């Protein structure tokens, strides 16, 4: 029986309207010993608000059991540690796992929208690029939209370590050439702890 | 006990005829007492006799490490031939065999596009010159920057990323002093990939006053 502990999603911790959660997932729980007990601690102090799922049988004949703790946005961002302790009768000592935000001094992202290269205008679809650089830690959300609605066809690269020890990434949005040439506006919005109000937005249009 | 690792050539070694692509078979945790290792090599089942093994390197836990390098024809690797390394030893029951070959899949030509820095970046000491490379398959690729026929190395590239059509893209960011950009220097983004004519293409980027 193994334990895997998951941090909340970055967008959820950066935005007070959303609800950040840490998730403790226990796998390889047997039929022979099918009950699990969780104990949840924030900075070593036991908490009691966790919601545990009823166990679910997998295709491989084992059980999956999941416990979810809601965390306060500011506790996560302030580096508090979350411990999930799991007990089972086929376990000599219970497994403990501990998670918290990436350590290190935060650096603020610099966001740059780059139009498509002149050479790409011969194609039916063009590439609008969002350079997000100079940020730390790596946890970040970068999204594209137009007229306040999420754009369909894009992908970000993973964050990459830069020479100064900060991170960068690129997000590529693909749009029909006509939509660009008709002069529609597109915006890359970025969320990160080091941004004022955890949010900045940069637009990009043909002119 | 004894393990074997089989490594492939560096993409660009295979992509330029002047360079020497190698398949490298490394053997580790060879016993202190009965060490002698023999290397057999095969290309599509057919034995080849030009591998250059190095004498054993004794470690600091009474274990030997014995590397063996096989030079490979460029066009063989690109044409999907299979390279088998066979390592035998007295302390093995069966000799260990490992096989390796190029990533499969229909090749697709990368498209290459240089993007200048956003005007919002010109308030900084250093600016970002960007090369987008998309539509390529397989992911094996080399991207490099230069100026005035000297390599320009203050750049980092992203990993290849699977795009929404099965092809890969990546970006490579070059960082240069703002002054160098403002003065009209040409920077170029070299791309090397099996699906490009002559395995090479190059795109340039300069300031427009
Ligand atoms: C019966 O069925 C059961 C049910 O299926 C089955 O259970 C399964 O068991 C296996 C192992 O036994 C479990 O495997 C584990 O999976 C974990 C979760 O993996 C996923 O998430 C990872 C992280 O994702 C974030 O981060 C990535 C990079 O950092 C990003 O790429 C992601 O996008 C994502 O980012 C997002 O979140 C960030 C915050 O986290 C945020 O910043 C960011 O912005 C963004 O929002 C991914 O890495 C991972 O992807 C892997 O797999 C896919 C293919 O599916 C590949 O394409 C990827 O490249 C990658 O390889 C998943 O999406 C893992 O964390 C866990 O890893 C650890 O354990 C393994 C060995 O098991 C180690 O090799 C590994 O190194 C990790 O351990 C290390 O650290 C610990 C301590 O920290 C250390 O002790 C250890 O020694 C080691 O160093 C592992 O792989 C699987 O989860 C179970 N499934 C389920 C459904 O529960 C069961 O086994 C079956 N029974 C059998 C087989 O008998
Ligand atoms: C005794 O000492 C030597 C040297 O420290 C150890 O050799 C090392 O063995 C590890 C374990 O397999 C090798 O790891 C391999 O690394 C490559 C990276 O390219 C990876 O692709 C492989 O999958 C694997 O993880 C490692 O290369 C090797 N070190 C060296 C310098 O060659 C050995 O394990 C030790 N033996 C013990 C502790 O019993």
End-to-end CA distance of chain B: 66
Distance CA(B162)–CA(B170), nearest Å, equals: 9
Chain centroid to CA A162: 20
Distance CA(B126)–CA(B171), nearest Å, equals: 18
Give the total residue count for chain A: 207
Place of tokens 């999941």: A66
Closest by Cα among B23, B54, B15, B24 to B201:
B15
- A123: closest CA of chain B, how far (Å): 11
Distance CA(A128)–CA(A130), nearest Å, equals: 7
Yes or no: say if A80 and A73 are a contact pair by the CB < 8 Å rule: no
- Written as six digits, the tokens of B53 are 């093994």
Counting ligand 2 atoms within 8 A of each CB, the residue from B3, B4, B5 with the most, and so the one to mutate, is: B5
List Cα–Cα distances, B66 to A50, A138, B32, B63, in angstroms: 54, 39, 13, 10
Distance CA(B77)–CA(B73), nearest Å, equals: 7
Distance CA(B40)–CA(B89), nearest Å, equals: 12
Beta bridge partners of B67: B26
H/E run at residue A27: strand A21-29
Q: A33 φ, ψ to 5°?
A: -140, 80
Distance CA(B173)–CA(B132), nearest Å, equals: 9
Annotate B40-92 with DSSP letters as a single string.
Answer: EEEETTEEE---EEPPPEE-SSS-EEEEEEEE--HHHHHTT--EEEEEE-TT-
CA angle A124/A126/A132 to nearest 5° reads 165
Q: Give the number of other CB atoms < 10 A from CB of residue B73.
A: 12
Q: Which ligand is nearest to the CA of B1?
A: 2
Q: Which regions of chain B does DSSP assign to beta strands (E)?
A: 3-7, 22-30, 38-43, 46-48, 52-53, 57-58, 64-71, 83-88, 96-100, 111-115, 126-136, 142-147, 150-151, 155-157, 161-162, 168-177, 187-192, 201-205
Distance CA(B139)–CA(B11), nearest Å, equals: 10
Q: A126 φ, ψ to 5°?
A: -120, 165
Q: Which chain A residues touch B if contact means CB-CB below 8 Å?
A: 110, 112-117, 119-120, 123, 127, 129, 131, 133, 153, 155-158, 160-163, 168-170, 172, 174, 202
DSSP code of residue A136? B
Yes or no: say if A198 and A191 are a contact pair by the CB < 8 Å rule: yes
- Written as six digits, the tokens of B168 are 């890969």
Distance CA(A80)–CA(A40), nearest Å, equals: 13
Determine which of A108, A110, A115, A117 to mutate to test the interface with B (most B C-beta atoms within 10 Å): A117
Residues of chain A with C-beta less than 8 angstroms from the C-beta of B171: 129, 157, 170, 172
H/E run at residue A74: helix A73-77
Q: Nearest Cβ partner of B169 from A115, A161, A172?
A: A172
Indicate the SS3 state at residue B104: coil
Residue B12 Cα to ligand 2 midpoint, Å, equals: 26
Cis upstream peptide for A137 (omega within 30°): yes
Distance CA(B199)–CA(A122), nearest Å, equals: 23
Q: Do B158 and A172 touch (CB under 8 A)?
A: no
Q: Which ligand is nearest to the CA of A3?
A: 1
Chain centroid to CA B203: 21
H/E run at residue B13: helix B11-15
Residues of chain B with C-beta less than 8 angstroms from the C-beta of A157: 158-159, 161, 170-171
Indicate the SS3 state at residue A14: helix
Residues contacting B20, CB < 8 A, separation 6+: B13, B71
Beta bridge partners of B172: B131, B157
Residues contacting A80, CB < 8 A, separation 6+: A42, A43, A71, A100
* Burial (Cβ within 10 Å: 0-12, 13-18, ≥19) of residue A27: middle
| Resolution given for this structure, in angstroms | 2.5
> Which experimental approach was used here?
X-ray
Q: Do A112 and B118 touch (CB under 8 A)?
A: yes
- Written as six digits, the tokens of B24 are 């490298």
Place of tokens 């490594």: B7
List Cα–Cα distances, A107 to A70, A168, B127, B204, in angstroms: 27, 11, 18, 32
Indicate the SS3 state at residue B203: strand
Give the total residue count for chain B: 209
Residue of the CA atom closest to atom 20 of ligand 2: B5
Distance CA(B182)–CA(B170), nearest Å, equals: 26
* Burial (Cβ within 10 Å: 0-12, 13-18, ≥19) of residue A206: middle
The CA dihedral of B137, B142, B145, B146, to the nearest 10 degrees, is -120
Which domains, and CATH codes, for chain B?
1-101 (2.60.40.10), 102-209 (2.60.40.10)
Q: A31 φ, ψ to 5°?
A: -65, -45
């Amino acid at each position: 029986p193994s334990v895997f502990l998951f941090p909340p999603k970055p967008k959820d911790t950066l935005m007070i309207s959303r609800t950040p959660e840490v998730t403790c997932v226990v796998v390889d729980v047997s039929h022979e010993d099918p009950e699990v007990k969780f104990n949840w601690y924030v900075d070593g102090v036991e908490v009691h608000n966790a919601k545990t799922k009823p166990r679910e049988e997998q295709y491989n004949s084992t059980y999956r059991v999941v416990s979810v703790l809601t965390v306060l946005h500011q506790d996560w961002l302030n580096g508090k540690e979350y411990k999930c302790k799991v007990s089972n009768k086929a376990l000599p000592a219970p497994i403990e796992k501990t998670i918290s935000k990436a350590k290190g001094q935060p650096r603020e992202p610099q966001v740059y929208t780059l139009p498509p290269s002149r050479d790409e205008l011969t194609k039916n679809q063009v590439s609008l690029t969002c350079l997000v650089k100079g940020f730390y830690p790596s946890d970040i959300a970068v999204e594209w939209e137009s007229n306040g609605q999420p754009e369909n066809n894009y992908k970000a690269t993973p964050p990459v370590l830069d020479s100064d020890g900060s991170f960068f990434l690129y997000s590529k949005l693909t749009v029909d050439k006509s939509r660009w040439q008709q002069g529609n506006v597109f915006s890359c919005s970025v969320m990160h702890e080091a941004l004022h109000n955890h949010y900045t937005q940069k637009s990009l249009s043909l002119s």
